[PDB]
Design a protein around this ligand. Structure first.
Ligand SMILES: O=c1c(OCCN2CCn3c2nc2ccccc23)cn(CC2CC2)nc1-c1ccnn1-c1ccccc1
Ligand SMILES: [Mg+2]
Ligand SMILES: [Zn+2]
Length: 315
């Protein structure tokens, strides 16, 4: 498997398309691992990682994604692609160390997801909630990443100094934890404050950390930035997972919230429209302000918002 990954070369017809923000990995399933390799080589360089070690890692990350409806291997690579697209359009702003870290972080950010939110795990006293009190899945996601790296021949960061090793793991850690949506709101609030006051400074490390976290949220939610046919289909996978969690609450004789209730299916468009307005639009708006080149993400999100409006209005 990993041996065949080393031999892979991306088709020429996709060389330009992959650079686009709205690129869908959808039709190219068996290429997803190589697509990641491609993005790493172009963004970090071919001399960045040992090829064999990188291929082992990717395949192990792959297998450690469960067959859940949404929080799966496809979502891992999709997010990793948005990160690539963001990094490619802001080539100067991010350090060599940040580029490696972020692409890996995105690929691993949902490692071994079960399809349950943190709320579910904490409410029903799951062992992971017993372990990680806050940002439950996210800490497990990072924990799984460290485990995969500590496997033999999987340590891709072995050619980096002890100091560079502890830096990149912290970059990954902060970035995976930043994918907790609960933390996004506070983060985006502070960022807008710093923008309008003009106190945003990318020399300041904690300001870098905030921007990266927003980038994470942006890359994580990037299903709302694809062409409508793709966005719509992915919305199905998201709700399939929401409802399965709701079903597990129903099995205990507990009514879930309408979002996780499949008997409330009809309100999905209005649910999306609100989510777009409250969460997605402000996310990409603030990101576009911070990184003008990422503007095609906001634009695409605007387009899907109006599609949802048309769904509600019946058009
Ligand atoms: O699509 C999303 C979404 O839709 C729900 C909209 N709502 C609100 C009330 N309500 C809705 N549908 C309803 C239908 C009926 C009734 C009330 C309803 C909500 N959330 C946030 C979720 C709480 C973690 N995230 C995404 C999203 C977009 C892209 N990735 N991604 C994501 C992020 C993290 C985790 C999973 C998915
Ligand atoms: Mg997650
Ligand atoms: Zn995610």
């Amino acid at each position: 498997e990993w041996q065949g990954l080393m031999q892979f070369t991306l088709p020429v017809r996709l060389c330009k398309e992959i650079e686009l923000f709205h690129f869908d990995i959808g039709p190219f399933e068996n290429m997803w691992p190589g697509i990641f390799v491609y993005m790493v080589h172009r963004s970090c360089g071919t001399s960045c990682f040992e090829l064999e070690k990188l291929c082992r890692f990717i395949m192990s990350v792959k297998k450690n994604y469960r067959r859940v409806p949404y929080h799966n291997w496809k979502h891992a690579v999709t997010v990793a692609h948005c990160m690539y697209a963001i990094l490619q359009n802001n080539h100067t702003l991010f350090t060599d160390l940040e580029r490696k870290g972020l692409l890996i972080a995105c690929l691993c950010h949902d490692l071994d997801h079960r399809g349950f939110s943190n709320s579910y795990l904490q409410k029903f006293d799951h062992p992971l909630a017993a372990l990680y009190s806050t940002s439950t899945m996210e800490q497990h996601h990072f924990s799984q990443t460290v485990s995969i790296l500590q496997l033999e021949g999987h340590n891709i960061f072995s050619t980096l100094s002890s100091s560079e090793y502890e830096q990149v793991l912290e970059i990954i850690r902060k970035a995976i934890i930043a994918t907790d949506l609960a933390l996004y709101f506070g983060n985006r609030k502070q960022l807008e404050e710093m923008y309008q006051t003009g106190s945003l400074n990318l020399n300041n490390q904690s300001h870098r950390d905030r921007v990266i976290g927003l980038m994470m949220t942006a890359c994580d939610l990037c299903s709302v930035t694809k062409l409508w046919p793709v966005t719509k289909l992915t919305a199905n996978d998201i709700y399939a997972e929401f409802w399965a969690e709701g079903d597990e609450m129903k099995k205990l004789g507990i009514q879930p919230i309408p979002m996780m209730d499949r008997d409330k299916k009809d309100e999905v468009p209005q649910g999306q429209l609100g989510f777009y307005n409250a969460v997605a639009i402000p996310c990409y708006t603030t990101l576009t302000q911070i990184l003008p080149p990422t503007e095609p993400l906001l634009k695409a999100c605007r387009d899907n918002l109006s599609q949802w409006e048309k769904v509600i209005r019946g058009e």
